[PDB]
CSV table of C-alpha atoms and ligand atoms in Angstrom, one decimal:
chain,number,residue,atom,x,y,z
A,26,UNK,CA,0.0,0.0,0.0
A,27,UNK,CA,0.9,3.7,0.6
A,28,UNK,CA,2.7,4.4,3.3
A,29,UNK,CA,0.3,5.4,6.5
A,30,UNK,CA,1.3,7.7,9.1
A,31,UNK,CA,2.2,5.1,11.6
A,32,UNK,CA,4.9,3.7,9.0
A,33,UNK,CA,6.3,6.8,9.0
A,34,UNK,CA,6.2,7.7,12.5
A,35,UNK,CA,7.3,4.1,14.4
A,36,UNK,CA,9.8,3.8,12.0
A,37,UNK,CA,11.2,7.3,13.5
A,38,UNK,CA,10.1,6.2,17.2
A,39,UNK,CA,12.2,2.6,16.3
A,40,UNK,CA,15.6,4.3,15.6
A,41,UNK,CA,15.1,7.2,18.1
A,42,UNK,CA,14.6,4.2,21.1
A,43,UNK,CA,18.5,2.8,19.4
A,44,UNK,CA,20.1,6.4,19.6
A,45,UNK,CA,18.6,6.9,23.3
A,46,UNK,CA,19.2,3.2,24.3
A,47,UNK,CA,15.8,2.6,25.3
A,48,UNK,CA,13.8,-0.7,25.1
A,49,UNK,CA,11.4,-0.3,21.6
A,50,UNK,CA,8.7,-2.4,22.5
A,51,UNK,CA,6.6,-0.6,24.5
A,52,UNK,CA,6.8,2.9,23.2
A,53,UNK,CA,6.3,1.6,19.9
A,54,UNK,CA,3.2,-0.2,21.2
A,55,UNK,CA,1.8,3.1,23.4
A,56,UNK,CA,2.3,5.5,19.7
A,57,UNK,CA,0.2,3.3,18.1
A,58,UNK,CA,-2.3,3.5,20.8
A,59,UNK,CA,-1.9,7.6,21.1
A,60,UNK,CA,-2.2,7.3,17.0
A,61,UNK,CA,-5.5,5.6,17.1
A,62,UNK,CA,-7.4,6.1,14.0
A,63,UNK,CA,-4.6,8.3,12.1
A,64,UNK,CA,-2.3,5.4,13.0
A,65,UNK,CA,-3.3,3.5,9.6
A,66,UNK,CA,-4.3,6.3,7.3
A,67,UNK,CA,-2.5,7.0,3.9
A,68,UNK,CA,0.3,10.1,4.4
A,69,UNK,CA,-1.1,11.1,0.6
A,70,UNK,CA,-4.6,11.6,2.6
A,71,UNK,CA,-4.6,15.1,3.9
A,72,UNK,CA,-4.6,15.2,7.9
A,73,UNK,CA,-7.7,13.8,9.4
A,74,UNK,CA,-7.8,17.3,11.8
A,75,UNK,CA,-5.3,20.3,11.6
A,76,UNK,CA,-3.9,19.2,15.4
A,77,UNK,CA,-1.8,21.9,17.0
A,78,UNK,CA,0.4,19.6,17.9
A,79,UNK,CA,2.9,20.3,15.0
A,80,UNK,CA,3.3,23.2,12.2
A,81,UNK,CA,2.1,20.3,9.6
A,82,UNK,CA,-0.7,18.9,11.8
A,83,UNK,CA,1.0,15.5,12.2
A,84,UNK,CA,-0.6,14.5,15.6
A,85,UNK,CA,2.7,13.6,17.7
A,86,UNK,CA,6.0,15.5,17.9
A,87,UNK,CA,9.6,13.4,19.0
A,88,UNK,CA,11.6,14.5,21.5
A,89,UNK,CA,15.0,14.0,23.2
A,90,UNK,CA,16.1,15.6,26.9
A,91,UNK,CA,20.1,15.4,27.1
A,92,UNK,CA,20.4,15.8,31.2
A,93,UNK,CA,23.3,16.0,33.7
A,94,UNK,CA,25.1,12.3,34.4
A,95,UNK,CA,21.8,10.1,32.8
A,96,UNK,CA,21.2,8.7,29.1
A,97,UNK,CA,19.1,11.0,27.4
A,98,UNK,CA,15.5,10.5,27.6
A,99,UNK,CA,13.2,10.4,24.5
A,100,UNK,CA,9.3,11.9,24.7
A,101,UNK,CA,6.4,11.8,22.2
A,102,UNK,CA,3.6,14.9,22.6
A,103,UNK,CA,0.5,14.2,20.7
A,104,UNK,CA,-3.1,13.7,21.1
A,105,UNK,CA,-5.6,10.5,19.5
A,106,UNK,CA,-8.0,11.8,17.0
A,107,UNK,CA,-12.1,11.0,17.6
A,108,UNK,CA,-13.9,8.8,15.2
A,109,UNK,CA,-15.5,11.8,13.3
A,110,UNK,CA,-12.4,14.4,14.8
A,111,UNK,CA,-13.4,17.0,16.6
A,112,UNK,CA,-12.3,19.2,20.2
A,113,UNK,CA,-14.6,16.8,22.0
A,114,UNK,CA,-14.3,13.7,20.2
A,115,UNK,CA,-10.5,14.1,20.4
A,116,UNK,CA,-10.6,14.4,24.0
A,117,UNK,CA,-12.8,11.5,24.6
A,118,UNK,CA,-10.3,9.1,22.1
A,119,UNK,CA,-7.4,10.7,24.2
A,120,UNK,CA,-8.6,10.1,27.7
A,121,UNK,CA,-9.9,6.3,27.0
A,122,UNK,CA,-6.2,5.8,25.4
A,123,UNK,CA,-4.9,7.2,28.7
A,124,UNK,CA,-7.4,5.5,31.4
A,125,UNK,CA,-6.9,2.4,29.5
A,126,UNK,CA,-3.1,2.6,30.2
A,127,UNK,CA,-3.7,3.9,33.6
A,128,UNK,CA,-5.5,0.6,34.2
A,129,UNK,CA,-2.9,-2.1,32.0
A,130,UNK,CA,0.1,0.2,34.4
A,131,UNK,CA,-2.0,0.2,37.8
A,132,UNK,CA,-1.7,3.3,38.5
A,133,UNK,CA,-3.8,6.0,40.7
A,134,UNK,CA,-5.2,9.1,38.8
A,135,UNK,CA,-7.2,10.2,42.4
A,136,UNK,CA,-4.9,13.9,42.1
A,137,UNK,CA,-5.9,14.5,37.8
A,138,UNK,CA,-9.0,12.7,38.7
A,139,UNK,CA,-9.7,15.8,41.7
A,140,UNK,CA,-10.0,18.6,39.3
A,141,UNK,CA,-11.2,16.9,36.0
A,142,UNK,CA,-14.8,18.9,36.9
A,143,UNK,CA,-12.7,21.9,36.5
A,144,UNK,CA,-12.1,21.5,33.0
A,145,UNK,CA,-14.9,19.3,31.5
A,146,UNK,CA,-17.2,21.2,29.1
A,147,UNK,CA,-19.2,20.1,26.3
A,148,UNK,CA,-18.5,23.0,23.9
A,149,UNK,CA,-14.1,22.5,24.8
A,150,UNK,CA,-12.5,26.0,23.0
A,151,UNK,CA,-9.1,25.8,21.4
A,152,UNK,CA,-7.8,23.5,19.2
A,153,UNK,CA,-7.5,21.1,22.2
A,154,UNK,CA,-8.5,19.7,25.8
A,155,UNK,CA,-6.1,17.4,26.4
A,156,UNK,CA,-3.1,15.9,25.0
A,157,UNK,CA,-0.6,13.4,26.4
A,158,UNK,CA,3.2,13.0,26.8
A,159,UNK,CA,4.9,9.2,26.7
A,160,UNK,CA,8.2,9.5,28.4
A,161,UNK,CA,10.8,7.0,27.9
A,162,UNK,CA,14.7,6.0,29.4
A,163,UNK,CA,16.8,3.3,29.7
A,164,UNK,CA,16.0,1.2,32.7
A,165,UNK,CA,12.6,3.0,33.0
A,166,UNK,CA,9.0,1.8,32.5
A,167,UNK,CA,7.0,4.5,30.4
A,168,UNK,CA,5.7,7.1,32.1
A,169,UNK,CA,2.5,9.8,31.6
A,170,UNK,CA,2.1,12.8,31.0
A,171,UNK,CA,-1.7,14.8,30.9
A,172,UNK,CA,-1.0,18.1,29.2
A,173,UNK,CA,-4.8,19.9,29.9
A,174,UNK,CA,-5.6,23.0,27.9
A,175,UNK,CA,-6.0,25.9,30.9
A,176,UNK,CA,-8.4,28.0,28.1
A,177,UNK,CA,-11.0,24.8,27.2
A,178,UNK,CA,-13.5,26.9,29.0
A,179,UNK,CA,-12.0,30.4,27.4
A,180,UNK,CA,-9.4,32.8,27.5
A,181,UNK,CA,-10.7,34.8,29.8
A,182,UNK,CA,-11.6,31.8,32.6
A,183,UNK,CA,-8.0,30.4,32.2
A,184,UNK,CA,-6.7,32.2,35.2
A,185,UNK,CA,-9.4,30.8,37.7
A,186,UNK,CA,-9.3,27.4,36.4
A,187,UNK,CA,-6.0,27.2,37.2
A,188,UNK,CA,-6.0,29.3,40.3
A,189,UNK,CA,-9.5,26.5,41.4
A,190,UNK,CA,-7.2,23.7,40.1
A,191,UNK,CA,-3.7,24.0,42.0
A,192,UNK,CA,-5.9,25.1,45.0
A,193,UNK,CA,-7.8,21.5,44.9
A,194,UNK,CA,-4.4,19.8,44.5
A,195,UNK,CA,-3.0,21.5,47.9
A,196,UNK,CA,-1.1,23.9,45.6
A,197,UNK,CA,-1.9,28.0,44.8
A,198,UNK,CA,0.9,29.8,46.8
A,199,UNK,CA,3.9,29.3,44.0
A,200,UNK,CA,1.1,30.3,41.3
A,201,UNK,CA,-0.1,33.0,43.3
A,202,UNK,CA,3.7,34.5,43.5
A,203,UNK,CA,3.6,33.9,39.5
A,204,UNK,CA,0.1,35.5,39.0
A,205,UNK,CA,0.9,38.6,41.3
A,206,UNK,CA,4.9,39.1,40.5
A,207,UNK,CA,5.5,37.0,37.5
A,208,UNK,CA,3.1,38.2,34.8
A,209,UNK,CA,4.0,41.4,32.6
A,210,UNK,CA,1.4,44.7,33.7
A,211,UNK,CA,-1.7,43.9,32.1
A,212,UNK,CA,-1.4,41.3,30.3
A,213,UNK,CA,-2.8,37.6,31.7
A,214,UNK,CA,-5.0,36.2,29.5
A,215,UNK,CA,-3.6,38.7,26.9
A,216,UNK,CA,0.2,39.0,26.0
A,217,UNK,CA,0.5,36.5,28.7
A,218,UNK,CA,-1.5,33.3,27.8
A,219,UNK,CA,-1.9,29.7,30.2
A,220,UNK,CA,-1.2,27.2,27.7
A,221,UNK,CA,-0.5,23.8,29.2
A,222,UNK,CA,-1.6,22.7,32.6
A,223,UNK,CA,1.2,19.3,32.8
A,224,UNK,CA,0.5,16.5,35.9
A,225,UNK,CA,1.7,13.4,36.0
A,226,UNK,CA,-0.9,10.4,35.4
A,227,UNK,CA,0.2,8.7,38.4
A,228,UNK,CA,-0.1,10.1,41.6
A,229,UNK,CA,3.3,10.8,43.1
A,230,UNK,CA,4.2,11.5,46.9
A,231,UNK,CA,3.6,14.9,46.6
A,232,UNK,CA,1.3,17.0,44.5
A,233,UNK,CA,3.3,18.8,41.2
A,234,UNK,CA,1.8,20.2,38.1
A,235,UNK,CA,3.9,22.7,35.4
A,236,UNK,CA,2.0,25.2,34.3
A,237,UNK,CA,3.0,26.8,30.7
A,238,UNK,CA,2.8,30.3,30.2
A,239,UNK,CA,3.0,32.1,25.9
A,240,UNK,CA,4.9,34.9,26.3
A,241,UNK,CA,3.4,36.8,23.2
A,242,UNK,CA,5.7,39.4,20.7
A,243,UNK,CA,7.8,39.5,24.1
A,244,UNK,CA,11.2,41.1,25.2
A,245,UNK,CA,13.9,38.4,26.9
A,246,UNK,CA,14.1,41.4,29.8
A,247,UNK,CA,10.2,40.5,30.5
A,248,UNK,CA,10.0,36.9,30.3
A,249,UNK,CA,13.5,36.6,32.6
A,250,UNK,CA,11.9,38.6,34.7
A,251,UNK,CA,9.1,36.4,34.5
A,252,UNK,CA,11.4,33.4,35.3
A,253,UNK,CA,13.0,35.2,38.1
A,254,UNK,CA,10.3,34.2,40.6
A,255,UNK,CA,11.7,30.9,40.3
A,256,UNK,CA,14.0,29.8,42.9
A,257,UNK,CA,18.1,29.6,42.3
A,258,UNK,CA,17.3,30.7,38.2
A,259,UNK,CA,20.3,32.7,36.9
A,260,UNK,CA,18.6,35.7,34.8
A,261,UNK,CA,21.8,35.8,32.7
A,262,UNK,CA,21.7,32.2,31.7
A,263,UNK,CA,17.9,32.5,30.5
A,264,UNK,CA,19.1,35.7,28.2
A,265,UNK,CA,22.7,33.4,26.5
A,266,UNK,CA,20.2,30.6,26.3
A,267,UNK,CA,18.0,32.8,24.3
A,268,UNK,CA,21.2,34.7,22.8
A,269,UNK,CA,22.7,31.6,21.0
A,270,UNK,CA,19.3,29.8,19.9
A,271,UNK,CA,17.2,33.0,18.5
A,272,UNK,CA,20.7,33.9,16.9
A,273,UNK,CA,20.9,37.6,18.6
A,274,UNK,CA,16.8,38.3,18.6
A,275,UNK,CA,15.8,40.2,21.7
A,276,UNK,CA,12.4,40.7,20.6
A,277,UNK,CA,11.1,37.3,19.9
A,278,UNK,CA,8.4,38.5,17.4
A,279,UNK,CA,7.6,35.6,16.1
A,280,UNK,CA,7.1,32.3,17.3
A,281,UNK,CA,6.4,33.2,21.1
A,282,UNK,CA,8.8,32.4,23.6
A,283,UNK,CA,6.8,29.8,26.2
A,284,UNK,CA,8.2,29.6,30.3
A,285,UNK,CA,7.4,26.5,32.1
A,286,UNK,CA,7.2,26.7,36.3
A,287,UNK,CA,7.1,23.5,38.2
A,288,UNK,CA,4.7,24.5,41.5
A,289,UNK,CA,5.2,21.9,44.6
A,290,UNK,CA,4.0,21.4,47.6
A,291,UNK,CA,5.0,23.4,50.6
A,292,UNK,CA,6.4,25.8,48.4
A,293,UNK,CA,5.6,29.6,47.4
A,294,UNK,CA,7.7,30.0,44.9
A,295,UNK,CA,8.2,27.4,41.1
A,296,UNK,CA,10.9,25.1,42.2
A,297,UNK,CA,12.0,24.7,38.4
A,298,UNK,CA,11.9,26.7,35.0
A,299,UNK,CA,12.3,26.1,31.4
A,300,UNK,CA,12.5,28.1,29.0
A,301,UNK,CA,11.2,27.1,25.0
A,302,UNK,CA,12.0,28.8,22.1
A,303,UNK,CA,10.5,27.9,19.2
A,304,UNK,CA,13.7,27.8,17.3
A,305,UNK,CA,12.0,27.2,13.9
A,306,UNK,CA,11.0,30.7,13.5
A,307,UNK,CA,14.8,32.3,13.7
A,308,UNK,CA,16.6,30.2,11.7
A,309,UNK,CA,17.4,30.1,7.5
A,310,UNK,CA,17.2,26.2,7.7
A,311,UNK,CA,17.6,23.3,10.6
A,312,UNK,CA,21.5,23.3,9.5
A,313,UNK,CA,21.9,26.6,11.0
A,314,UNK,CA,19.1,25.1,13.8
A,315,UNK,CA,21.3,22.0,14.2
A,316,UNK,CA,24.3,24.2,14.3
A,317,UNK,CA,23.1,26.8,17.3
A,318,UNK,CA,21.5,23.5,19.6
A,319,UNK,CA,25.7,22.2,18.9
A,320,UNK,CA,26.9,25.2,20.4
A,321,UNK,CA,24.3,25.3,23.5
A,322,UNK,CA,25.0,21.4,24.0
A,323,UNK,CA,28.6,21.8,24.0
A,324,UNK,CA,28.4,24.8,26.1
A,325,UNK,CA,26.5,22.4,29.1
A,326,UNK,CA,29.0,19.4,28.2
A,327,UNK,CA,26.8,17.5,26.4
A,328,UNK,CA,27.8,15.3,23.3
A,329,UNK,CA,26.7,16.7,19.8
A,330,UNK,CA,26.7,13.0,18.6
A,331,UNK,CA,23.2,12.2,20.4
A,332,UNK,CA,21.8,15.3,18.5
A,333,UNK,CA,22.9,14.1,15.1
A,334,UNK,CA,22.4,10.7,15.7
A,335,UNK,CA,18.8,11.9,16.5
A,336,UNK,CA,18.7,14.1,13.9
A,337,UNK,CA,19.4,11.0,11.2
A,338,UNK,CA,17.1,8.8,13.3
A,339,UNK,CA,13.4,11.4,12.0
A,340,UNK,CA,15.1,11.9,8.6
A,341,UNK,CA,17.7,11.3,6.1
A,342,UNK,CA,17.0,14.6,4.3
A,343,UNK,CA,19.8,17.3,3.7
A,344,UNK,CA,19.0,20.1,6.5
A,345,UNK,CA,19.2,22.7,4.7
A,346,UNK,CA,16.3,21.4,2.5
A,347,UNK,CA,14.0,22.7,5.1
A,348,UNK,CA,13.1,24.2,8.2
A,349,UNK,CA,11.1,23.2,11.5
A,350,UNK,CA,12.5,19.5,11.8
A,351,UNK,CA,14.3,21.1,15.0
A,352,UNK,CA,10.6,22.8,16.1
A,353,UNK,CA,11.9,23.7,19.9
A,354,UNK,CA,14.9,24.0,21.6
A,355,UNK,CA,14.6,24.3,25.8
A,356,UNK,CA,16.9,24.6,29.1
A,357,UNK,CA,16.0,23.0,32.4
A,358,UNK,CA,16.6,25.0,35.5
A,359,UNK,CA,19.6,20.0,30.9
A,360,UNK,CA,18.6,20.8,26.9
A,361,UNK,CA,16.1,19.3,25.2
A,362,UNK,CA,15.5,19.2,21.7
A,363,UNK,CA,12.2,18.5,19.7
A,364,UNK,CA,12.1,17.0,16.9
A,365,UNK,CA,9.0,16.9,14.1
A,366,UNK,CA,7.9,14.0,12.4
A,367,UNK,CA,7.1,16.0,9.1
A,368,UNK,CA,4.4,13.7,8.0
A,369,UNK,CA,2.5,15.7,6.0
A,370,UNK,CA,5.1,18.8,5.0
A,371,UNK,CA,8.8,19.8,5.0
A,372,UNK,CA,8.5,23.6,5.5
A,373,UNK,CA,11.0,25.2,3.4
A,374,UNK,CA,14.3,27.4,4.0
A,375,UNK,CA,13.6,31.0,4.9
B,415,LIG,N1,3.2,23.0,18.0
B,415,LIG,C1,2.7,23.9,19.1
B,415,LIG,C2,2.7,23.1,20.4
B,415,LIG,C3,4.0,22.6,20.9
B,415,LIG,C4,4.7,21.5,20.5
B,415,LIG,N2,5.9,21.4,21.2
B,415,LIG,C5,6.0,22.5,22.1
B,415,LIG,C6,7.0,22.9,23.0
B,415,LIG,C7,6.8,24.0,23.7
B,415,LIG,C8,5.7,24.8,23.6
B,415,LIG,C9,4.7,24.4,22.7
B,415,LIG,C10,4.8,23.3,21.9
B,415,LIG,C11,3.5,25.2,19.2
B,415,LIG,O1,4.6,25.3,18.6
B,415,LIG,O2,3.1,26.1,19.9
């Protein structure tokens, strides 16, 4: 037949478990179950739904998170279309995936499960509800990720959603800090957007979500500043970070630069920070993408051969054919690099 969208995409999940050293089996099993009904549709068939997931609507984007003294770990992002796809439908096929693996792993959902109220609606806005991250190592069973849309009941109840939400989950005082000293004058819900609202599936020891925040047509000075509510975050670092991948930008006008703060219990301020930019958008080519994530990975220490190994692993294509294989590029307060399946389009050089 034609090739489907799974062919192409566990073929990349295959090698990409080799470069990272992780076990195959599994993940490859849990993207065909995120995949669900695009899993065996034609790539010459446009995409069955324009999922925000990636710039070419493939449902699932790769990832791999070079960190301090561990093998690097590889993550899939994506969502599982409905029958007839739709917002709703989409978040119904995603959540059975997820309960169903919640059940086959045996583990407790009791903290998502608290504030699911919070965010179910039958009329979901955005192009999503919910999608899920897979998250794989060496020596490591899978783990889940629930990635839940803070706007699904608007822009303009996102701040109380998540302000009801971390407040169910024993949470609020790190958020507050962020809503009250972290967001630029005037602008939540506006220039400053909730985008992700990230728990674990399982319940841990201690309740933890991330919360995401878009920092729209934004200055480095204002989303540092942003990031310096976060305990032990060097201001500086943020700003070479941003230096080196954006290629001198200050003014990320753009793709928006994105912040990530990791609230935890007995804590009132984040406890961690990434930053995200959306490399992609300041770059010629993923060459010159390629070539700045080198310099940031050697700068921590890191080997360049995981990148490229990773690189050759999604595709074989020249990279300066194109633009938006490397989509992201982030730094953990490690570097983590993300990496699209271009299933449906190679954007090209710029
Ligand atoms: N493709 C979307 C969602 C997304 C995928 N990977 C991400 C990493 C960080 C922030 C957002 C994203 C975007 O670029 O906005």
């Amino acid at each position: 037949a034609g090739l489907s969208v799974s062919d192409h995409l566990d073929g990349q999940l295959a090698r990409l478990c080799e470069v990272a050293g992780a076990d195959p089996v599994e993940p490859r099993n849990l993207l065909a179950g995120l995949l669900g009904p695009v899993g065996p549709r034609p790539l010459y068939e446009p995409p069955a739904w324009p999922s925000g997931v990636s710039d070419d609507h493939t449902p699932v984007e790769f990832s791999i998170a070079f960190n301090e003294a561990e093998p690097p770990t590889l993550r899939i992002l994506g969502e599982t279309l409905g029958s007839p796809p739709g917002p709703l439908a989409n978040l119904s096929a995603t959540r059975g995936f997820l309960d169903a693996q919640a059940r086959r792993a045996g583990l407790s959902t009791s903290r998502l499960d608290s504030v699911r109220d919070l965010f179910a609606t039958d009329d979901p806005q955005g192009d999503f509800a919910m999608w899920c991250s897979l998250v794989f190592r060496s020596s490591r069973r899978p783990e889940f990720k629930v990635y839940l849309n803070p706007e699904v009941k608007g822009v303009e109840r996102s701040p109380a959603l998540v302000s009801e939400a971390l407040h169910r989950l024993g949470l609020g005082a790190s958020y507050r800090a962020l809503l009250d000293h972290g967001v630029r004058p005037g602008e939540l819900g506006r220039g400053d957007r909730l985008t992700f609202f990230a728990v674990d599936l399982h319940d841990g020891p201690q309740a933890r979500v991330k919360l995401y925040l878009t920092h729209h047509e934004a200055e480095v000075w204002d989303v540092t500043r942003a990031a310096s509510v976060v305990d032990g975050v060097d201001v500086a670092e943020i700003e070479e970070f941003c230096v080196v991948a954006g290629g001198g930008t200050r003014r990320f006008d753009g793709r928006p630069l994105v912040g990530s703060y990791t609230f935890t219990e007995g804590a009132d301020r984040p406890v961690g920070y990434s930053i995200y930019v959306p490399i992609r958008s300041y770059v010629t080519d993923d060459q010159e993408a390629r070539d700045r994530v080198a310099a940031l990975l050697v700068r921590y220490g890191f080997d360049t051969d995981g990148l490229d190994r990773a690189i050759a692993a999604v595709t074989p294509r020249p990279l300066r054919d194109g633009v938006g294989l490397i989509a992201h590029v982030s730094l953990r307060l490690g570097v983590t690099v993300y990496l699209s399946a271009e299933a449906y389009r190679v954007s090209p050089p710029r």
